[PDB]
C-alpha cells in the first residue's frame, strides 16, 4: 500500500481519492491519504469550499514515485509534486502516520468498482493524453478543453483524445459512402482499432479515462469523448464479440457508479437511446440496458 | 443556415447556387400481386438540380436498372442522388461549381454532406420554403424524357425558357413556382389554362409556351385563381 502526504490544508476544500470523497476545514490538521491500492492508477481531486468553481485534480501510479500535495498560495490550489529524497518522504510518512493525521483509501475487500472503472487505463496512456512530460502525474481539471474542441485555445493545456466525427474523410471511404455512413464498421475496426489504438484495450481505456474525467471533474470535452466512442462501437455492424461483451461490462460500471442527481448533465438522450435501441448492437449490452433502464427510464 | 423567407433574396445574387429535388427519384406504382399481396413496380425517375439565378436546370435520369436488387430502396434513392450530384459538381469547371447546394428535403443532407466531402467549402442547406418542384415531371417535355430514357442520362434545359431576356431571375423564379404550385395543386386544369390557346404555341427549344407579356399577367391571374379555388375545394371555404 502507498500513501500521498500532504503538507498541509490551509483551504477549505472536498477532496476526492477515486470514487470517495472527504470534506477538510480550514486548517484542520490534516496530512494525507493512507493505504492507496497499488496496481492501478488513481485520482486524488479537489473542489474549493469558497469557489466550487474549478474542479481540479491530479491522475497518480504510486509505482511511479513517491508523490504529495502543497498548496500553493500564489497560484491558490493543491498541487501534486515529486519527492526524489525516498528517505526523507518515508521519515514524513511515517510520523504522520504515527500521529494519525491520514485518512485511510477506504476500500471493501468484496469492492470491484475502481478497478472495473479503470481496468484498461494505464498512466503512460494518459500522460499522452495530458501532456506535461516533466511530471509523472497529469493534472485535468473541470475547464480544459480537448483537442476536438479547440478545432471547432491554448494547446499545451489541452486534453489529446483521439478524434472522432462521422462526418470526415477519416471516417468515410470514397466509393462507400452510403456503406461507411451507416455501418461504422470500417472506421472502427480499420481505423481507429487496427490503425491508431492498435488494439481494443488502449481503445478502451481512453474510453474510460474520459468517462472518469467527465464524472470527477464535469469536464464537458471529456463526456463528448466517452459518447463518442461508445456509438463508434454500437454503431458497427461487424464488432468482435470480446468488445461487445467486455463493453457492456465497462458501462455497466460506469452507470452503476454515476450519481443519481448527475444524470441530467453526463448522459447524452440521443447517444444512449439509438446505441440501446437503434442501433446495431442494441441486444448486445444486457447489463448495461437493464441497469439503465432501472436507474434512468426517464432518460430513455 | 436554413434558407428562408428572410434571406430571400440571396437566391438572385451572384454566388453560384443550386436547389436539389429528389421527390421524384424513386417513382413506383403499388399493385396486387396474384396472390393477393401488394408489390410495387419502380419507373424512371429523375434529380431536379436547379441554377435559380440563371434557370439551368441539370435533369439527371434515374433509370430503373439503378435499383435492380437493391434494398431499402427509398434510403437508397437519397445516397443516389447526392452521388449525383457530387458528380456534376466534379464534372464542372471550377469557376461554375456551386458555391451553395439549397436540398428541398432536410432528408437529403447527411447523404449530400457525405458526399461532398473533397469540397469543405461548398456549404450545404436546408431550406424552410415549401417549394413545388415535385411537380417538375408535370411539364411535358421533362416527362416524355424521363419515360423514353433506357438508360442513365443528363438532359440540360433552362427552366426559364427566354423570360430572363425581358424579366429578371426573381420574377422568372416567382413564375415557375406559380406555375408548378398550380400544376400540382391541379395538374388538368392548370396543363387547360396553359394550352387552351391554339395560336400560342411552345417553341421547339422550350418548355412553356411563347405568351407576351400582356398573355403572361393573365395566365399568371388564372393560376392564381386555381390555387384559390382549390383551396376553398379543400377546405370548404
Ligand atoms: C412567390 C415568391 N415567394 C416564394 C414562392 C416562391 O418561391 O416563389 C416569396 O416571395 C417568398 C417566399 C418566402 C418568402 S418570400
Known amino acids: 500500500m502507498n500513501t500521498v502526504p500532504f503538507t498541509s490544508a490551509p483551504i477549505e476544500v472536498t477532496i476526492g481519492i477515486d470514487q470517495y470523497s472527504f470534506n477538510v476545514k480550514e486548517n484542520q490538521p490534516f496530512h494525507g491519504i493512507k493505504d492507496i491500492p497499488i496496481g492501478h492508477v488513481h485520482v486524488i481531486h479537489f473542489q474549493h469550499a469558497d469557489n466550487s468553481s474549478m474542479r481540479y485534480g491530479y491522475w497518480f501510479d504510486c509505482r511511479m514515485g513517491n508523490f504529495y500535495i502543497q498548496y500553493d498560495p500564489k497560484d491558490g490550489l493543491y498541487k501534486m509534486m515529486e519527492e526524489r529524497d525516498g528517505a526523507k518522504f518515508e521519515n514524513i510518512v511515517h510520523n504522520f502516520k504515527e500521529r494519525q493525521m491520514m485518512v485511510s483509501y477506504p476500500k471493501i475487500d468484496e469492492d470491484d468498482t475502481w478497478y472495473n472503472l479503470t481496468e484498461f487505463v494505464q498512466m503512460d496512456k494518459i500522460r499522452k493524453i495530458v501532456r506535461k512530460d516533466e511530471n509523472q502525474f497529469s493534472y485535468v481539471d473541470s475547464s480544459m478543453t480537448t483537442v476536438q474542441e479547440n478545432e471547432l485555445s491554448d494547446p499545451a493545456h489541452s486534453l489529446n483524445y483521439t478524434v472522432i466525427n462521422f462526418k470526415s474523410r477519416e471516417a468515410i471511404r470514397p466509393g462507400h459512402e452510403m456503406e461507411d455512413f451507416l455501418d461504422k464498421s470500417y472506421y472502427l475496426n480499420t481505423v481507429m482499432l487496427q490503425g491508431i489504438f492498435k488494439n481494443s484495450s488502449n481503445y478502451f481505456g481512453e474510453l474510460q479515462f474520459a468517462f472518469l474525467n467527465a464524472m470527477f471533474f464535469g469536464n464537458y470535452g471529456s463526456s463528448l469523448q466517452w459518447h463518442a466512442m461508445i456509438e463508434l462501437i454500437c454503431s458497427s455492424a461487424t464488432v468482435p464479440k470480446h468488445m461487445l461483451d467486455k463493453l457492456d461490462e465497462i458501462l455497466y460500471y460506469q452507470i452503476k457508479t454515476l450519481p443519481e442527481q448527475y444524470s441530467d448533465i453526463l448522459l447524452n438522450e440521443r447517444v444512449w437511446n439509438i446505441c440501446l435501441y437503434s442501433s446495431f448492437q442494441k441486444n448486445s449490452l444486457h447489463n448495461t440496458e437493464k441497469i439503465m433502464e432501472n436507474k434512468y427510464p426517464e432518460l430513455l | 443556415g436554413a434558407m428562408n423567407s428572410s434571406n430571400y433574396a440571396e437566391l438572385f445574387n451572384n454566388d453560384i447556387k443550386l436547389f436539389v429535388d429528389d421527390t421524384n427519384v424513386y417513382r413506383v406504382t403499388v399493385h396486387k400481386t396474384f396472390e393477393g399481396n401488394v408489390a410495387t413496380k419502380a419507373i424512371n425517375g429523375c434529380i431536379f438540380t436547379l441554377n435559380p439565378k440563371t ?46 447546394i439549397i436540398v428541398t428535403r432536410k432528408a437529403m443532407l447527411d447523404p449530400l454532406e457525405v458526399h461532398m466531402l473533397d469540397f469543405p467549402n461548398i456549404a450545404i442547406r436546408p431550406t424552410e420554403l415549401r417549394l413545388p418542384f415535385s411537380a417538375a415531371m408535370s411539364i411535358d417535355k421533362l416527362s416524355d424524357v424521363v419515360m423514353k430514357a433506357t438508360e442513365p442520362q443528363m438532359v440540360l434545359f433552362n427552366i426559364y425558357d427566354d423570360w430572363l431576356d425581358r424579366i429578371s431571375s426573381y420574377t422568372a423564379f416567382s413564375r415557375l413556382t406559380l406555375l408548378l404550385r398550380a400544376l400540382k395543386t391541379n395538374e388538368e386544369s392548370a396543363k387547360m389554362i396553359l394550352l387552351s390557346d391554339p395560336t400560342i404555341t411552345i417553341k421547339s427549344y422550350h418548355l412553356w409556351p411563347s405568351f407576351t407579356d400582356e398573355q403572361w399577367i393573365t395566365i399568371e391571374s388564372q393560376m392564381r385563381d386555381l390555387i384559390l379555388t382549390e383551396y376553398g375545394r379543400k377546405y370548404n371555404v
Do not use: D, N
Not at chain 2, 434557370?55 to 430502396?73: D, E, M, Y
Not at chain 2, 466534379?90 to 461549381?97: A, D, F, I, M, V
Open chain 2, 55 to 100: 434557370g439551368h436546370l441539370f435533369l439527371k435520369i434515374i433509370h430503373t436498372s439503378v435499383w435492380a436488387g437493391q434494398k431499402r430502396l427509398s434510403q437508397l434513392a437519397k445516397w443516389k442522388t447526392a452521388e449525383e450530384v457530387s458528380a456534376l459538381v466534379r464534372s464542372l469547371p471550377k469557376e461554375e461549381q456551386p458555391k451553395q
